[PDB]
Scaffold this motif. Structure first.
Motif, PDB file in Angstrom:
ATOM      1  N   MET A  89       0.786  -0.995  -0.559  1.00  0.00           N
ATOM      2  CA  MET A  89       0.267  -0.214   0.156  1.00  0.00           C
ATOM      3  C   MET A  89       0.571   1.300  -0.356  1.00  0.00           C
ATOM      4  O   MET A  89       0.798   2.243  -0.601  1.00  0.00           O
ATOM      5  N   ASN A  90       2.136   0.810   0.308  1.00  0.00           N
ATOM      6  CA  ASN A  90       2.916   2.783   0.806  1.00  0.00           C
ATOM      7  C   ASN A  90       3.596   2.478  -0.756  1.00  0.00           C
ATOM      8  O   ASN A  90       3.457   3.800  -0.567  1.00  0.00           O
ATOM      9  N   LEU A  91       3.911   2.023  -1.215  1.00  0.00           N
ATOM     10  CA  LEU A  91       4.563   1.914  -2.664  1.00  0.00           C
ATOM     11  C   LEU A  91       3.580   3.151  -3.363  1.00  0.00           C
ATOM     12  O   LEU A  91       3.795   4.184  -3.811  1.00  0.00           O
ATOM     13  N   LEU A  92       2.245   2.506  -3.810  1.00  0.00           N
ATOM     14  CA  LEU A  92       1.993   3.138  -4.484  1.00  0.00           C
ATOM     15  C   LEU A  92       1.237   4.287  -4.178  1.00  0.00           C
ATOM     16  O   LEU A  92       0.913   4.985  -4.761  1.00  0.00           O
ATOM     17  N   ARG A  93       1.023   4.321  -2.806  1.00  0.00           N
ATOM     18  CA  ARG A  93       1.218   5.921  -2.209  1.00  0.00           C
ATOM     19  C   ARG A  93       2.199   7.255  -2.289  1.00  0.00           C
ATOM     20  O   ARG A  93       2.213   7.881  -2.708  1.00  0.00           O
ATOM     21  N   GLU A  94       3.154   6.394  -2.794  1.00  0.00           N
ATOM     22  CA  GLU A  94       4.024   7.288  -3.986  1.00  0.00           C
ATOM     23  C   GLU A  94       3.880   7.869  -5.810  1.00  0.00           C
ATOM     24  O   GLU A  94       4.008   9.163  -6.087  1.00  0.00           O
ATOM     25  N   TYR A  95       2.901   6.654  -6.132  1.00  0.00           N
ATOM     26  CA  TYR A  95       2.473   7.258  -7.244  1.00  0.00           C
ATOM     27  C   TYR A  95       1.240   7.979  -6.915  1.00  0.00           C
ATOM     28  O   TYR A  95       1.137   9.208  -8.245  1.00  0.00           O
ATOM     29  N   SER A  96       0.439   8.116  -6.073  1.00  0.00           N
ATOM     30  CA  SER A  96       0.014   9.639  -6.258  1.00  0.00           C
ATOM     31  C   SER A  96      -0.927   9.617  -4.830  1.00  0.00           C
ATOM     32  O   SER A  96      -1.595   8.689  -4.013  1.00  0.00           O
ATOM     33  N   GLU A  97      -0.935  10.545  -4.382  1.00  0.00           N
ATOM     34  CA  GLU A  97      -1.376  11.044  -3.347  1.00  0.00           C
ATOM     35  C   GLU A  97      -2.814  11.207  -2.734  1.00  0.00           C
ATOM     36  O   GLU A  97      -2.855   9.924  -1.605  1.00  0.00           O
ATOM     37  N   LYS A  98      -3.714  11.384  -4.010  1.00  0.00           N
ATOM     38  CA  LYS A  98      -5.156  10.805  -4.224  1.00  0.00           C
ATOM     39  C   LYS A  98      -5.713   9.170  -3.761  1.00  0.00           C
ATOM     40  O   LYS A  98      -5.821   8.054  -5.259  1.00  0.00           O
ATOM     41  N   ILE A  99      -5.155   8.495  -3.218  1.00  0.00           N
ATOM     42  CA  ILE A  99      -5.247   7.101  -2.900  1.00  0.00           C
ATOM     43  C   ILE A  99      -6.045   6.548  -1.484  1.00  0.00           C
ATOM     44  O   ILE A  99      -6.732   6.924  -0.960  1.00  0.00           O
ATOM     45  N   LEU A 109      -6.639   4.309  -7.432  1.00  0.00           N
ATOM     46  CA  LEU A 109      -5.815   5.223  -7.326  1.00  0.00           C
ATOM     47  C   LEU A 109      -6.841   5.483  -8.478  1.00  0.00           C
ATOM     48  O   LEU A 109      -6.826   6.054  -9.447  1.00  0.00           O
ATOM     49  N   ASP A 110      -6.157   7.350  -8.206  1.00  0.00           N
ATOM     50  CA  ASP A 110      -6.306   8.514  -8.866  1.00  0.00           C
ATOM     51  C   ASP A 110      -5.482   9.358  -9.664  1.00  0.00           C
ATOM     52  O   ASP A 110      -4.303   9.788  -9.141  1.00  0.00           O
ATOM     53  N   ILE A 111      -5.452   9.371 -10.488  1.00  0.00           N
ATOM     54  CA  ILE A 111      -3.966   9.915 -11.700  1.00  0.00           C
ATOM     55  C   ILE A 111      -4.322  10.473 -12.887  1.00  0.00           C
ATOM     56  O   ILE A 111      -3.989  11.120 -13.644  1.00  0.00           O
ATOM     57  N   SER A 112      -5.544  11.213 -12.273  1.00  0.00           N
ATOM     58  CA  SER A 112      -6.366  11.833 -13.600  1.00  0.00           C
ATOM     59  C   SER A 112      -5.259  12.906 -13.758  1.00  0.00           C
ATOM     60  O   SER A 112      -5.219  13.637 -14.937  1.00  0.00           O
ATOM     61  N   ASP A 113      -4.845  14.158 -12.518  1.00  0.00           N
ATOM     62  CA  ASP A 113      -4.138  15.430 -13.623  1.00  0.00           C
ATOM     63  C   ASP A 113      -2.605  14.584 -13.095  1.00  0.00           C
ATOM     64  O   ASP A 113      -1.622  15.175 -13.154  1.00  0.00           O
ATOM     65  N   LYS A 114      -2.311  13.218 -13.341  1.00  0.00           N
ATOM     66  CA  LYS A 114      -0.849  12.535 -13.903  1.00  0.00           C
ATOM     67  C   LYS A 114      -0.911  11.879 -14.592  1.00  0.00           C
ATOM     68  O   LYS A 114      -0.108  11.247 -14.463  1.00  0.00           O
ATOM     69  N   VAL A 115      -0.815  11.825 -15.501  1.00  0.00           N
ATOM     70  CA  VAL A 115      -1.825  10.828 -16.058  1.00  0.00           C
ATOM     71  C   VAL A 115      -2.636  12.077 -17.092  1.00  0.00           C
ATOM     72  O   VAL A 115      -3.536  12.689 -17.346  1.00  0.00           O
ATOM     73  N   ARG A 116      -1.879  11.463 -18.812  1.00  0.00           N
ATOM     74  CA  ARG A 116      -2.126  12.476 -20.165  1.00  0.00           C
ATOM     75  C   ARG A 116      -3.577  11.449 -20.846  1.00  0.00           C
ATOM     76  O   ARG A 116      -4.485  12.456 -21.297  1.00  0.00           O
ATOM     77  N   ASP A 117      -3.348  10.171 -20.844  1.00  0.00           N
ATOM     78  CA  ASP A 117      -4.215   9.596 -21.346  1.00  0.00           C
ATOM     79  C   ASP A 117      -4.377   7.886 -20.938  1.00  0.00           C
ATOM     80  O   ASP A 117      -3.634   7.653 -20.635  1.00  0.00           O
ATOM     81  N   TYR A 118      -5.085   6.825 -21.807  1.00  0.00           N
ATOM     82  CA  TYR A 118      -5.300   5.585 -21.354  1.00  0.00           C
ATOM     83  C   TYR A 118      -3.750   5.133 -21.161  1.00  0.00           C
ATOM     84  O   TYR A 118      -3.743   4.164 -21.335  1.00  0.00           O
ATOM     85  N   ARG A 119      -3.220   5.459 -22.029  1.00  0.00           N
ATOM     86  CA  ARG A 119      -1.978   5.187 -23.230  1.00  0.00           C
ATOM     87  C   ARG A 119      -0.250   4.894 -22.249  1.00  0.00           C
ATOM     88  O   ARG A 119      -0.118   4.267 -22.211  1.00  0.00           O
ATOM     89  N   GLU A 120      -0.352   6.444 -21.769  1.00  0.00           N
ATOM     90  CA  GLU A 120       0.503   6.282 -20.509  1.00  0.00           C
ATOM     91  C   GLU A 120      -0.808   5.870 -19.162  1.00  0.00           C
ATOM     92  O   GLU A 120       0.427   6.043 -18.018  1.00  0.00           O
ATOM     93  N   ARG A 240      -9.886   5.880   2.860  1.00  0.00           N
ATOM     94  CA  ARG A 240     -10.657   5.413   4.111  1.00  0.00           C
ATOM     95  C   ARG A 240     -10.483   5.860   5.297  1.00  0.00           C
ATOM     96  O   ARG A 240      -9.236   6.098   5.751  1.00  0.00           O
ATOM     97  N   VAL A 241     -11.523   5.119   6.368  1.00  0.00           N
ATOM     98  CA  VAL A 241     -11.145   5.302   7.784  1.00  0.00           C
ATOM     99  C   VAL A 241     -11.793   4.628   8.159  1.00  0.00           C
ATOM    100  O   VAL A 241     -13.040   3.852   8.294  1.00  0.00           O
ATOM    101  N   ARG A 242     -11.552   3.536   9.308  1.00  0.00           N
ATOM    102  CA  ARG A 242     -12.153   2.750  10.435  1.00  0.00           C
ATOM    103  C   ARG A 242     -13.145   3.166  10.574  1.00  0.00           C
ATOM    104  O   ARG A 242     -12.683   4.125  11.773  1.00  0.00           O
ATOM    105  N   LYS A 243     -14.380   2.424  10.532  1.00  0.00           N
ATOM    106  CA  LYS A 243     -15.692   2.745  11.384  1.00  0.00           C
ATOM    107  C   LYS A 243     -15.910   1.537  12.223  1.00  0.00           C
ATOM    108  O   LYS A 243     -16.236   2.279  13.364  1.00  0.00           O
ATOM    109  N   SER A 244     -15.600   0.076  12.087  1.00  0.00           N
ATOM    110  CA  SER A 244     -15.631  -0.564  13.511  1.00  0.00           C
ATOM    111  C   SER A 244     -15.168  -1.799  13.604  1.00  0.00           C
ATOM    112  O   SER A 244     -14.821  -2.809  12.814  1.00  0.00           O
TER     113      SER A 244
END
Ligand SMILES: Nc1ccn([C@H]2CC[C@@H](COP(=O)(O)OP(=O)(O)OP(=O)(O)O)O2)c(=O)n1
Ligand SMILES: [Ca+2]
Ligand SMILES: [Ca+2]
Length: 343
Positions: A89-99, A109-120, A240-244
């Motif tokens: 989980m920690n690695l992925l955490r470096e590829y995108s802030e929004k996890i 993972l949200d790469i909206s503004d860190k990826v130009r298209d489905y290509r890259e 996410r947040v632990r609820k129970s």
DNA sequence: GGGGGAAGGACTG
DNA sequence: TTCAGAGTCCTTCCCCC
């Protein structure tokens, strides 16, 4: 807006093979034991080599050994896996802030503004899908699309050890071909109902009336589904947040006598408070598994936090509240806390 | 009059 | 005699500032 779904190929049984090299090339079955029947328990997971013959997670260990008797049955160790996962989980955490971590073997993972298209983006799934396979030696399946749900489907199709991309032109296609229960969120029950009425593909739902759909699955279920076929799903990637946080065990018993359950509850009520971290729960529930399935529960909410001891006490009143309301013996007993204290 | 609480059910997955 | 082992969210429902 494009999402990047990650799903650990097939976690447990896999990690079990990564540590014990003499396992691979064989059908491994990670499962949970209780200590009773003799081989009492259920199956937690199994590698694809073990699925072929049916041994699917959740079935009675006695049945598993009915199909794949020669397989390799290994006890479950949530502690071992937890740590691995905790690392990936920690690695992925470096590829995108929004996890957003869903379960122990998933993450959006949200790469909206860190990826130009489905290509890259497909190139990034790789750059990731790999950093993983050799830094933790774990294989994973990646999914990509315009949202979390479709991103998760592309990962379902492409597994194991794969990656797929559901483009817009393809989406409209899936909304027609994609069918029944293969829909994230819709369980077997909701499916065995819809099917009977002809609704098979995610589209069949559009030829109905929101209300005739509600009267059988629910407003949430329906709205959700019609939101897909209509192609206007929202749901963003938030932390996410632990609820129970809760814990349940199993009595080698099948009792009803308090001191024949008190030690058990006490036991669980101990482990749970270890996971509570520095949380303070205002709510607590005593979950009780009977014999003929059907779970029963009784709980209460307090206007203030809870101290271990405070819990112990209510536990009993909540357990007696249970017993005196059911004429069947109990097999497993547990407790769950919630409504933690804010900021 | 939308919300908090309690017991149940389902899908997690 | 004696089956199948953590967390979230939807729901039916009763009730109150
Ligand atoms: N009844 C079940 C089903 C699944 N799990 C566990 C298996 C590990 C984790 C994720 O499960 P899945 O992703 O559904 O399967 P997997 O083997 O982990 O990976 P895959 O989805 O690629 O098959 O939850 C469980 O505890 N109990
Ligand atoms: Ca997985
Ligand atoms: Ca999963």
């Amino acid at each position: 807006m494009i999402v990047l779904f990650v799903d650990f190929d097939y976690f447990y049984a896999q990690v079990e093979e990564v540590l014990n090299p003499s396992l691979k090339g064989k059908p491994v079955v990670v499962c949970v034991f209780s200590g009773r029947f003799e081989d009492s328990g259920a199956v937690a997971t199994a590698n694809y080599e073990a699925r072929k013959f049916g041994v699917k997670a959740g079935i009675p260990i006695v049945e598993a050994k009915k199909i794949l008797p020669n397989a390799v049955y290994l006890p479950m160790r949530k502690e071992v896996y937890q740590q691995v996962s905790s690392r990936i989980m920690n690695l992925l955490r470096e590829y995108s802030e929004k996890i957003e971590i869903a379960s122990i073997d998933e993450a959006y993972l949200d790469i909206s503004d860190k990826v130009r298209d489905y290509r890259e983006a497909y190139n990034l799934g790789l750059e990731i899908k790999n950093k993983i396979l050799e830094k933790e030696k774990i294989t994973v399946t990646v999914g990509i699309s315009k949202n979390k749900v479709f991103a998760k489907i592309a990962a379902d199709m492409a597994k194991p050890n794969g990656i797929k991309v559901i483009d817009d032109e393809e989406v409209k296609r899936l909304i027609r071909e994609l069918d029944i229960a293969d829909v994230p969120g819709i369980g077997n029950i909701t499916a065995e109902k819809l099917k009977k009425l002809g609704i098979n593909k995610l589209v069949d739902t559009l030829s109905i009336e929101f209300d005739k759909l509600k009267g059988m699955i629910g407003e949430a279920k329906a709205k959700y589904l019609i939101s897909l076929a209509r192609d206007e799903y929202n749901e963003p990637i938030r932390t996410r947040v632990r609820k129970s946080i809760g814990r349940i065990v199993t009595m080698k018993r099948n009792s009803r006598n308090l001191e024949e359950i008190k030690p058990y509850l006490f036991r669980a009520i101990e482990e749970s408070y270890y996971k509570l971290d520095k949380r303070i729960p205002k709510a607590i529930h005593v979950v009780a598994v009977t014999e003929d399935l059907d779970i029963v529960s009784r709980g209460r909410t307090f206007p203030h936090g809870i101290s271990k001891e405070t819990a112990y006490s209510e536990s009993v009143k909540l357990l007696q509240k249970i017993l005196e309301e059911d004429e069947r013996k109990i097999r497993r007993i547990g407790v769950r806390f919630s409504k933690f204290i804010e900021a």
